[PDB]
C-alpha cells in the first residue's frame, strides 16, 4: 500500500502548492518597484583581524557588538575585540576540523563543532583564569555544521546527520530532536524571539522548527541546489537563504512561499554566508568568487562588492546594532566592514 | 582616564601572550604535513589505519587523527570515519591538505568503477583541484592471484582490455607472469588517464602498487609528499 501513501503525498503537496498560489497575488518586486533604491553603498576594511593560522570557517559576533569569535581549521577559537583589533582569548581545540562557532548571548560561553561530531562548549568567565572545555555534547552521528545558543543553558546544534537537536548543557543529552531533513543540515538561525528556528539542508530545502515542540511547522523549498547558508530577517517574519545554485532566496513565514531570488547572470559560484542588516534592507551574502555582494532586500539589485578576500568567504555577520559587518574567508583573514560617511 | 589606560595595557599584554603562543603554533603547523586517507569499505584503508595506529603510536566520533614523525618530518594522517555516505560537504574541509592518499581495492574487479568515479570526483572537485593524490593500489597480491587463477575475466567488466598492451616503461616484479602485469598496469593507466584528462600543472597523481612489506609503502608516501612540497615551494617562489 506504499503506492496509496505516495498518492496521498502528491495530493497533499498539490493542495499545499495550490494554497500557496491562491495566496500568491503580487510579486514583491512589483510592490517594491516604487521603493527608492539605497543606491551604491561603499564600505571599507576599517580593521583587518589577522592571526588565524589556517582558513576561517565560521564567525559569530557578541551581543555587545564588540567581541567576536572565529573558528579556524588550525584548531583555534580566537576571540577578537573588534573596536581595538586585539585578541582577547585563544582556545586550542581537540579536533582541528571546526565548522561552526557560537557566542552565547550572555557572553559567558562559546561553542564549536565539526567533523568530530561533538559540540564543545567553553567557559569564558571561570572563577580562575584560562578557558576550559565546559561540556562535550555527543550524540550527533555526523559532522556538526551550525550551532546557536538559545540561552545561557540551552543550545541548538545542526549536524550533517540529517537531524538537528536542542541540548541541555548541564544535562548533556538531546532534550528535543528535530528530524525530517533528507540531506545534511548545514545552517541554523534563531528568531529574534527565541521560540522558533530554521535550518536549511542539502535536500535543497529549508524547514522551520518550533523549539518547545520538536516538529517542523513549515518546509520552505525552491532552491535548485543545497542550501548552505541561512539567516533570519530582523522582523522575525522572514528569512533568507544561500545555495550553491548561486541564487539567494527570501521566504516569508506567513505566506510560506518564495518572495524573491537574488540572482545575477555573472554570478555562478555558490553563496556561503548570508546575514541581513539591522534595518533588514541590506542583505549581505558572500560567494566562492572571493568577494561579498551586498543585495538590496526590497529590490533584487547588487548594492556593492566587498572585495578584498583572496580565497572564498565562509562566514559573514553584522553586529546587533548593525554598526559594522565582519566577513571571514579561507585566506585566514577576518575583515570588518563599516559604512563610509 | 587612568583605569581605561590600565585596561588597554592589560589587553595589549594579553595580545602579546596570545601572539607568542600563536607564533609557536604557526611553527608547529608549518612543520606538520596533513595527509587525508580516503577509500571505500572494501579498500584496504581500514588495514592501513589499524597498522598505523600501533606502528607510529596513533593518537586515535570517527576522525582518526594521528601525528607521527618519519625522518624528522611531521605528518598528520587522518580518515573521516564517523560521517555518512554524503561526501560533498565535509570534503571541503580538506582543500588545504598536503595529499589525499587514495586506497583502491584493485582486486574487486566489480567495484573498480566506484573507485574510478571517486577518483574523478576528488580530482575534478573545485576545492581539491590543487591537492595531489597518492594513488595506493592495494591488494596487488590478491589481484595477482585472481588473474593467475583465471575464472573471472576483467574483459567482462572493463571492455578495453582486449585492446591494451603493457607500456614500454614497465617495472614488473622479478618473477611474475605477463598477464598480471597487463591487468595491474591497465588499472593504473585507467586511473592515470582519468587524472590527466583534466586540469594539469597544479596537482599530480602518484600511482603505487602496494607490496607486502609496508616499509616500502611508507617510503613511497614519504617520497610523494616530499615531491608535492618541493613543487609547491617552486610555485610560491615563482620558479615554475
Amino acid at each position: 500500500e506504499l503506492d496509496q501513501l505516495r498518492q496521498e503525498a502528491e495530493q497533499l503537496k498539490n493542495q499545499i502548492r495550490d494554497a500557496r498560489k491562491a495566496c500568491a497575488d503580487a510579486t514583491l518586486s512589483q510592490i517594491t518597484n516604487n521603493i527608492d533604491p539605497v543606491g551604491r553603498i561603499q564600505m571599507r576594511t576599517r580593521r583587518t583581524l589577522r592571526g588565524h593560522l589556517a582558513k576561517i570557517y565560521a564567525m559569530h559576533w557578541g551581543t555587545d557588538s564588540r567581541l567576536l569569535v572565529s573558528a579556524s581549521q588550525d584548531g583555534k577559537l580566537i576571540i577578537w575585540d573588534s573596536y581595538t583589533t586585539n585578541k582577547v582569548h585563544a582556545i586550542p581545540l581537540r579536533s582541528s576540523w571546526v565548522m561552526t562557532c557560537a557566542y552565547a548571548p550572555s557572553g559567558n560561553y562559546v561553542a564549536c563543532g565539526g567533523l568530530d561530531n561533538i559540540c564543545s562548549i567553553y567557559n569564558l568567565k571561570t572563577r580562575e583564569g584560562n578557558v576550559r572545555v565546559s561540556r562535550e555534547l555527543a550524540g550527533h552521528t555526523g559532522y556538526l555544521s551550525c550551532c546557536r545558543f538559545l540561552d545561557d543553558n540551552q543550545i541548538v546544534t545542526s549536524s550533517g546527520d540529517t537531524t538537528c537537536a536542542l541540548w541541555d548543557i548541564e544535562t548533556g543529552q538531546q532534550t528535543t530532536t528535530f528530524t525530517g531533513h533528507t540531506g545534511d543540515v548545514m545552517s541554523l538561525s534563531l528568531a529574534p524571539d527565541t521560540r522558533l528556528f530554521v535550518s536549511g539542508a542539502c535536500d535543497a530545502s529549508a524547514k522551520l522548527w518550533d523549539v518547545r515542540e520538536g516538529m517542523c511547522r513549515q518546509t520552505f523549498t525552491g532552491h535548485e541546489s543545497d542550501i548552505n547558508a541561512i539567516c533570519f530577517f530582523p522582523n522575525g517574519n522572514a528569512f533568507a537563504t544561500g545555495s550553491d545554485d548561486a541564487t539567494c532566496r527570501l521566504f516569508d513565514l506567513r505566506a510560506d512561499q518564495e518572495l524573491m531570488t537574488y540572482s545575477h547572470d555573472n554570478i555562478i559560484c555558490g553563496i556561503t554566508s548570508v546575514s541581513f542588516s539591522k534595518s533588514g534592507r541590506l542583505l549581505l551574502a558572500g560567494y566562492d568568487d572571493f568577494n561579498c555582494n551586498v543585495w538590496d532586500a526590497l529590490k533584487a539589485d547588487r548594492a556593492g562588492v566587498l572585495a578584498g578576500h583572496d580565497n572564498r568567504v565562509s562566514c559573514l555577520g553584522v553586529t546587533d546594532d548593525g554598526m559594522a559587518v565582519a566577513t571571514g574567508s579561507w585566506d585566514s583573514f577576518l575583515k570588518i566592514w563599516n559604512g563610509s560617511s | 582616564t587612568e583605569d581605561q589606560r590600565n585596561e588597554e595595557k592589560a589587553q595589549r599584554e594579553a595580545n602579546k601572550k596570545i601572539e607568542k603562543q600563536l607564533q609557536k603554533d604557526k611553527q608547529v603547523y608549518r612543520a606538520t604535513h596533513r595527509l587525508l586517507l580516503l577509500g571505500a569499505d572494501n579498500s584496504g584503508k581500514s588495514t592501513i589505519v589499524k597498522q598505523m595506529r600501533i606502528l607510529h603510536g596513533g593518537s586515535g566520533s570517527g576522525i582518526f587523527e594521528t601525528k607521527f614523525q618519519v625522518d624528522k618530518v611531521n605528518f598528520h594522517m587522518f580518515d573521516v570515519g564517523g560521517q555518512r555516505d554524503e561526501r560533498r560537504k565535509w570534503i571541503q574541509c580538506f582543500n588545504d591538505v598536503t595529499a589525499i592518499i587514495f586506497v583502491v581495492d584493485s582486486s574487486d574487479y566489480n567495484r573498480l568503477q566506484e573507485a574510478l568515479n571517486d577518483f574523478k570526483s576528488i580530482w575534478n572537485n573545485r576545492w581539491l583541484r590543487t591537492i595531489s593524490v597518492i594513488l595506493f593500489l592495494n591488494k596487488q597480491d590478491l589481484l595477482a592471484e585472481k588473474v593467475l587463477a583465471g575464472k573471472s575475466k576483467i574483459e567482462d567488466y572493463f571492455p578495453e582490455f582486449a585492446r591494451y598492451t603493457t607500456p614500454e616503461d614497465a617495472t614488473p616484479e622479478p618473477g611474475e607472469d605477463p598477464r598480471v602485469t597487463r591487468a595491474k598496469y591497465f588499472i593504473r593507466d585507467e586511473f592515470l588517464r582519468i587524472s590527466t584528462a583534466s586540469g594539469d600543472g597544479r596537482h599530480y597523481c602518484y600511482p603505487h602498487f602496494t607490496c607486502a612489506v609496508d616499509t616500502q609503502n611508507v617510503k613511497f608516501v614519504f617520497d610523494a609528499v616530499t615531491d608535492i612540497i618541493i613543487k609547491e615551494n617552486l610555485k610560491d617562489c615563482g620558479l615554475f
Partner: nanobody
Amino acid sequence: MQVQLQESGGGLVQPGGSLRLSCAASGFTFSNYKMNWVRQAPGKGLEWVSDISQSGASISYTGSVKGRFTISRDNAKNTLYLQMNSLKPEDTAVYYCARCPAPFTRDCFDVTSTTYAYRGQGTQVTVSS
C-alpha cells in the same frame, strides 16, 4: 518548485531486447547539470551507469554498458534519455536518474549514496525470460 526527477519506461523485456528510459525534470535549470544514471541490482548497492555533460560533449558509460546503452540529453524538454539495448538478466534493476549536486561544475560526488535528494523513485527494468 520542489526538485523532482520522475523516471519512466521500466518494463519486462526478454534478453536481447530494447527499452527506452525517460527522466522528466522540473524545478531546476536542466542545462547546467551533469545528469547521471544510477541503478540498483537486487541485493546490491547503487552503481553508476552513465553520465552526460551540459551539452552532451562529454559522455561516459560504465564498462559493463560501454557498447550497449546510449545517453541523450534534450535540453529543450529537460529530459534525459537512457536508451537500453541488448538487455541481459545482469541488467535487471530499478533505474534512478540523478543530477550532479552543483551547477556549472563537473564533480559529481554524492550520486550513488544511500540517500540523495536530487534523484527519483525510479522504474524497474526487468529482463526476466
